[PDB]
Design a protein around this ligand. Structure first.
Ligand SMILES: Nc1ncnc2c1ncn2[C@@H]1O[C@H](CSCC[C@H](N)C(=O)O)[C@@H](O)[C@H]1O
Ligand SMILES: [Mg+2]
Lengths: 362, 213, 53, 42, 198, 26, 91, 246, 127
């Protein structure tokens, strides 16, 4: 439980970055690779020993002005090539193949900026895209068809911000500016019929446009947790985690401690809070936390450049942990944290187009 | 009589007597309850299918070929509409097939709210200087932000080819849009918004054409 | 009309028609032209219209 | 005041009118820009 | 590879060039008429007959077009055109509604590889097909509204070829005399000047 | 005034016609 | 080259179509006529005109009766064009 | 005559030059022999800019500026622009699209040269239409009679049932009935009172098996009572319903 | 379970940038090292283009009007481009007065699950 600054870098365009994503699809032993997106550029690096990090590749968009926002690593079932997709303010989604160093797929169906991208833990052709259009879409990146559109008569009213798959990949949570957090399901018969259909469609075959699925109702929701924005949520086994600009992270479960997660009636009107976590100076929004693939530690960026670290272990959240690893160079802000498949290294992005690196000493 | 003090007639659902003079007779017109003679047409309404047993309004509540050109909204036979990025600002509707002047096109549906309520959302709509608000009567305002149909995507002009008509149907106000001339395939649609000329130039100041003379 | 006025159409700000050419197809032209000239020297010798050997 | 402050995303916070050759000056601006005389038309 | 990149470039260039040629046309032609069909064609034949309605500024002509669709029902088509027949006239030049209109559709089995009208009878035309034979038709014997079923009266098809071809020529002086030429390395000649038992 | 703006802008249309020059010439 | 067609109404006028997305018009009278170096760099004399409409392989074309100087053209791009050249070129 | 140029940049700056070997195009080296023809060839061919004739005393001067709009965008099947890459510009198989027709050259003027002067309609669909609800392209075949609009929106049927279920002071033998009816009401849009007789007729004509399978006909009759009470049924049909029921 | 399924795969390694001769002239990027390391330099890579579409929002279709009860509390606060209201931060307060200062989440003063409320009500005897 000790990371040390073994390297720190800085870009040249000096425009703030947002994204950090190790490729968690490393065949055991392969080098550590990770990427980061900035104003209108992407960056490819590789972790080396002795705090060495090596520039690998970088692309850029010129034909317009955009501030890229998110990324996600996946692969191709067909030939196992690594796959990275990104999206920015323009609201378009691109798909790049580093093996050929080209973009092979682009998607345009939103109406505003995008805010996050994630994949189904099991299926690799299912991309979830969260936007400001109040609508959370979901694509089959392989047959080039939309599937669902969550939002409508009972959706979010203002600029959905963040979402998160359950650990197994059948349940989602969503959070946006309207203090509102709503539950969606995927396991429903209708849903999976739809998905299977999606995996089968030839445009040349029919004169019909594929028929998506519109969903106008959350499985459950409330706004009683915070009295401010909510901009990042994390499934916890069957528990919940969320942050606000109120300088505290909270864990809770819906209903009562006795209430199972999978028996919850849609008209449920109660929630159970368990504990709180604390920190200092997160007085702005759009700042995220991450966790190890082994769900044992917690990382979080900070406004003034600090850090705050806990353990996801039996440490009682009343007095679970407190670990602040700090350096004296930048205190502008830190947007996002990221671990490898193991807990070896931890990266974070400062607000000034500067990178950091922290090598763990257990 | 509340009907009376409302300067409004009696509808068959009123409790004004079965001969209460405050009631309304009903269309009698023969060719179509449509031109400048038919009384329903003057006191702008649609000849209800209980009364105009002459212009066919009653007939063919199932069949779809009638004579009363003043029954369409109830039957609701709009046209086939398309969508595309406009040539003025963002999106904008496009018609599909030719149409003769003074003809039905569609309704302008939406949510309904009290007057003052509409003055709150409008405060924000003004900020971005974009809105969907539309005033229905002295008391109610229709809102096409969260719900509606394609027509919400029509653009403003000053010499347009369509116009609105606050009508009165079955004791309920509505809104219809009708062509202002003949129109063939593919054109775009407009109609004056009837803004105050000051704000009209503030929010909607695009011309699409220069001074011909 | 059989005869109307000349071509006149303008307003405050019409939408921009989203030009076609991309940087990605642009730079290839530049590169090609450079090595071409350094094989040819026409802007220097052939005045853009005559080829040296 | 606390329930009245708007939330914030970010922190608190040529002389010689020479010739057409200016064209031939412009398109190559590296890697052996020929004619050696375009630099005057910088 | 390379050819892909190169072709993208070439496409963009061609687009530019067409833009220029369009901008430059007005000083170049005495007429510009462009029209887009849903499916392309492979044939071209002007019907030798013309009608010119009075009180107007335009003639009327009929054109013989084929069809090679992707997969769906094939058709033989002949449509209408309103050429300006005037020197002082110029919505655009005449009426406002339309200057071109389809008038003749006939179901067709396979694409059209060739089509020419008979010089002696314009109501007689020939047809080369993806098959190894020839088809003849007389439009006056079929409605413009096409058979929604599909294939219909071949109207005395022919025989004598084994692969498809493209050659087609009636004899101008002699009726019925018509030549053919196909991948068979052969020239086949029918004489339909008199075939009572079709 | 980063004159590269004036440069970069008028840079673009040039090479196009330049290529086009040769092309049309042949 | 895939098509050649003489001109009705004109004894010395012919037409050449092919795949180059172009269309030519020749002249049998101007065979080897001394032309200015700029006329020559324009092209040889006997070549009369070149059509510049289509943007694909020109599938087919045709003269017509009933009209002196017009030809329709069909490409592989669902495109049908009809034109009449300017008059000044001849005479 | 010495010829000069001037390169405007929205007046924030500029640059000026002079034409060498003038009357030959500074780009395509086209030999124009007149200021007239040269001005023409320039304002037409090299169109991506704009020009102006200044007539400096030395013989000619042209202050150039960039075009502002220059609507240059792809002119083909307007759909290809959005084909997922690798398929766009396939150019290897016939494709169907909507018909259009333009006219550009109808009757020329054929005027004469005038240096003082120096200082097209549509028919058919000419754009890319989109789906009303997903903002996706619209194939030329999908734009057929399919009109993606009718009286019954799914989300509405759901919402009304749910709202009904909020009510506490009701028996299931009533809620089920109200829903089973209101939905069929929506399904056809009944307005005229002369329809209500046929209405209840068709209602059981559809929901016969169900109410039987629901064993709920007795509350159906209570509803018939209520409706006659509201002066829309005659007694001459109330029974007639229970008759047709079995 | 997940680690298991992950253990059934095989995935390529990436190769670092290798500039192609197709662009002898381009731009490049470099990253300074804040620590004792040199700086690497690599030519940028250009992406193809895609076309965008105008803005739009969420909305559900309809064919007849719809009643809506009134709204008394704000329940949410908008967000401009954070530079506009940097000059007109009062508009917020104006709106606040319009709704007479009432937004959901405000005046929360903690939380209540109505069970402790019932307990206090039974406990808060008349004193
Ligand atoms: N002609 C015009 N000029 C300027 N603004 C216009 C306009 N037509 C519509 N608008 C804007 O659009 C709003 C009406 S809602 C229609 C929006 C538009 N049709 C679209 O592309 O989505 C108005 O509030 C106004 O702000
Ligand atoms: Mg493409």
């Amino acid at each position: 439980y000790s990371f040390k600054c073994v390297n720190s870098l800085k870009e040249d365009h000096n425009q703030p970055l947002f994204g950090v994503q190790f490729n968690w699809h490393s065949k055991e032993g392969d080098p550590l690779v990770f990427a980061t997106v900035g104003s209108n550029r992407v960056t490819l690096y590789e972790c080396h020993s002795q705090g060495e990090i090596r520039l690998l590749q970088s692309y850029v968009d010129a034909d317009a002005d955009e501030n890229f926002y998110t990324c996600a690593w996946t692969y191709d079932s067909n030939t196992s090539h690594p796959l990275l997709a990104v999206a920015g303010s323009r609201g378009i989604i691109r798909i790049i193949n580093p093996i050929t160093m080209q973009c092979i797929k682009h998607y345009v169906g939103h109406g505003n900026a995008i805010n996050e991208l994630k994949f189904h833990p099991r299926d690799p052709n299912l991309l979830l895209s969260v936007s400001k259009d109040h609508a959370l879409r979901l694509w089959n990146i392989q047959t080039d068809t939309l599937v669902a559109i969550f939002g409508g008569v009972e959706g979010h009213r203002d600029e959905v911000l963040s979402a998160d798959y359950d650990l197994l990949g059948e349940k989602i949570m969503s959070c946006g500016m309207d203090h509102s957090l709503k539950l969606w399901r995927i396991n429903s018969k209708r849903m999976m019929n739809a998905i299977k259909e999606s995996y089968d469609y030839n445009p040349n075959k029919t004169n019909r446009p594929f028929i998506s699925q519109k969903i106008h109702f959350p499985d459950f929701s409330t706004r009683d947790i915070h009295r401010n924005y909510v901009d990042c949520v994390r499934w916890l086994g069957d528990l919940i985690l969320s942050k606000s600009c109120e300088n505290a992270i909270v864990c809770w479960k819906p209903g009562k401690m006795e209430d199972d997660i999978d028996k919850i009636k849609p008209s449920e009107s109660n929630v159970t809070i368990l504990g709180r976590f604390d920190y200092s100076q997160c007085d702005i929004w759009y700042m995220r936390f991450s966790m190890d693939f082994w769900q044992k530690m917690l990382a979080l960026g900070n406004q003034v450049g600090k850090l705050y670290v806990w353990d996801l272990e039996v440490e009682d959240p009343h007095k679970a942990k407190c670990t602040t690893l700090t350096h004296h160079k930048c205190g502008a802000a830190i947007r996002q944290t990221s671990f490898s498949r193991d807990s070896s290294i931890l990266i974070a992005v400062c607000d000034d187009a500067s990178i950091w690196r922290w090598d763990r000493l257990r | 009589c509340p009907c009376v003090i409302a300067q409004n007639f009696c509808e068959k659902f009123c409790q004004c007597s079965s001969e209460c003079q405050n009631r309304f007779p009903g269309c009698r017109c023969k060719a179509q309850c449509n031109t400048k003679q038919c009384p329903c047409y003057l006191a702008v309404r649609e000849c209800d299918p209980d009364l105009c047993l002459t212009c066919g309004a009653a007939d063919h509540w199932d069949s779809k070929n009638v004579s009363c050109k003043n029954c369409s909204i109830q039957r609701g036979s709009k046209k086939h509409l398309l969508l595309a990025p406009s040539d003025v600002a963002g999106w904008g509707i496009f018609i599909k097939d030719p149409v003769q002047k003074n003809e039905f096109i569609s309704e302008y549906c939406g949510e309904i709210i009290s007057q003052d309520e509409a003055d709150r959302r409008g405060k924000v709509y003004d900020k971005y200087m974009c809105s969907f608000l539309f005033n229905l009567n002295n008391d109610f305002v229709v809102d096409a932000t969260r719900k509606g149909n394609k027509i919400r995507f029509a653009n403003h002009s000053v010499n347009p080819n369509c116009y609105a008509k606050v009508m009165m149907v079955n004791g309920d106000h509505r809104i219809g849009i009708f062509a202002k001339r003949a129109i063939q395939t593919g054109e775009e649609l407009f109609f004056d918004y009837r803004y105050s000329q000051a704000d009209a130039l503030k929010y909607v100041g695009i011309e699409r054409e220069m001074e011909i003379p | 009309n059989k005869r109307r006025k000349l071509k006149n159409k303008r307003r405050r700000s019409l939408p921009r028609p989203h030009d076609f050419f991309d940087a990605q197809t642009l730079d290839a032209i530049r590169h090609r032209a450079i090595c071409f000239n350094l094989s040819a020297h026409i802007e220097s010798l052939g005045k853009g219209h005559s080829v040296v050997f | 005041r606390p329930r009245l402050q708007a939330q914030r995303k970010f922190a608190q916070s040529p002389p010689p009118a020479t010739q057409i050759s200016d064209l031939s000056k412009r398109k190559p601006k590296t890697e052996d820009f020929l004619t050696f005389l375009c630099l005057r038309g910088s | 590879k390379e050819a892909a990149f190169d072709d993208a470039v070439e496409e963009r260039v061609i687009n530019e060039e067409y833009k220029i040629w369009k901008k430059n046309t007005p000083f170049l032609y005495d007429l510009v008429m462009t029209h887009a069909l849903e499916w392309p064609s492979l044939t071209a034949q002007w019907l030798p007959d013309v009608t010119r309605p009075e009180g107007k500024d335009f003639s009327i002509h009929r054109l013989v077009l084929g069809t090679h669709t992707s997969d769906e029902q094939n058709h033989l088509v002949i449509a209408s055109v309103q050429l300006p027949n005037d020197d002082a006239q110029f919505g655009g030049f005449g009426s406002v509604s339309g200057k071109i209109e389809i008038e003749i559709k006939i179901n067709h089995e396979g694409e059209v590889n060739r089509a020419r009208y008979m010089p002696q009878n314009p109501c007689i035309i020939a047809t080369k097909t993806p098959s190894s034979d020839v088809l003849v038709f007389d439009y006056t014997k079929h409605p413009s509204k096409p058979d929604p079923s599909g294939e219909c009266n071949p109207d005395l098809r022919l025989r004598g070829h084994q692969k498809e071809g493209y050659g087609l020529s009636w004899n101008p002086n002699l009726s019925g005399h018509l030549l053919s030429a196909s991948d068979d390395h052969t020239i086949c000649l029918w004489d339909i000047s008199a075939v009572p038992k079709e | 005034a980063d004159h590269e703006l004036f440069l970069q802008a008028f840079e673009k249309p040039t090479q196009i016609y330049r290529f086009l020059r040769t092309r049309n010439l042949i | 080259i895939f098509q050649v067609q003489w001109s009705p109404h004109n004894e010395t006028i012919l037409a050449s179509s092919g795949t180059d997305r172009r269309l030519n018009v020749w002249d049998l009278s101007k065979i080897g006529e001394e032309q200015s170096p700029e006329d020559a760099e324009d092209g040889p004399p006997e070549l009369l005109f070149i059509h510049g409409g289509h943007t694909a392989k020109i599938s087919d074309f045709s003269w017509n009766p009933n009209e002196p100087w017009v030809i329709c053209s069909v490409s592989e791009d669902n495109i049908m064009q009809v034109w009449q050249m300017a008059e000044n070129i001849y005479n | 005559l010495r010829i000069f140029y001037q390169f405007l940049y929205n007046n924030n700056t500029r640059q000026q030059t002079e034409a060498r070997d003038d009357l030959h195009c500074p780009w395509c080296t086209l030999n124009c022999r007149k200021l007239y023809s040269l001005l023409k060839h320039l304002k037409l061919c090299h169109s991506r800019f704009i020009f102006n004739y200044v007539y400096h005393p030395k013989g000619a001067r042209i202050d150039v500026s960039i075009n502002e709009c220059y609507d240059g965008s792809y002119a083909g099947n307007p759909q290809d622009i959005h084909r997922q890459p690798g398929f766009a510009f396939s150019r290897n198989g016939p494709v169907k699209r909507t018909p259009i027709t333009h006219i550009l050259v109808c009757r020329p003027k054929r005027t004469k040269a005038s240096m003082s002067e120096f200082l097209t309609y549509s028919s058919g669909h000419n754009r890319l239409y989109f789906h009303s609800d997903t903002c996706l392209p619209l194939r030329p075949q999908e734009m057929e009679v399919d009109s993606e609009d009718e009286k019954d929106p799914e989300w509405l049927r759901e919402k009304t049932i749910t709202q009904i279920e909020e009510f506490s002071d009701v028996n299931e033998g009533e809620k089920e009935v109200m829903k089973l009816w209101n939905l069929h009401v929506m399904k056809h849009g009944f307005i005229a009172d002369n329809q209500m007789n046929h209405a209840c007729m068709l209602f059981v004509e559809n929901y016969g098996q169900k109410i039987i399978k629901k064993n709920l006909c007795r509350n159906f009759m209570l509803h018939l009572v209520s409706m006659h009470d509201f002066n829309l049924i005659s007694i001459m049909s109330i029974d007639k319903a229970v008759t047709k029921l079995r | 379970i997940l680690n298991q399924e992950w253990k059934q795969r095989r995935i390529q390694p990436v190769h670092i940038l290798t500039s192609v001769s197709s662009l002898r002239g381009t731009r490049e990027c470099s990253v300074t090292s804040d620590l004792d390391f040199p700086t690497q330099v690599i030519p940028l890579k250009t992406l193809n283009a895609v076309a965008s579409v105008p803005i739009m929002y969420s909305w559900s279709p309809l064919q007849q009007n719809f009643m809506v009860e009134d709204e008394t509390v704000l329940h949410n606060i908008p967000y401009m481009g954070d530079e506009v209201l940097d000059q007109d931060g009062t508009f917020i307060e104006e709106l606040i007065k319009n709704y007479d200062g009432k937004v959901h989440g405000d005046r929360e003063c903690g939380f209540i699950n109505d069970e402790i409320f019932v307990e206090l009500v039974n406990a808060l005897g008349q004193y």
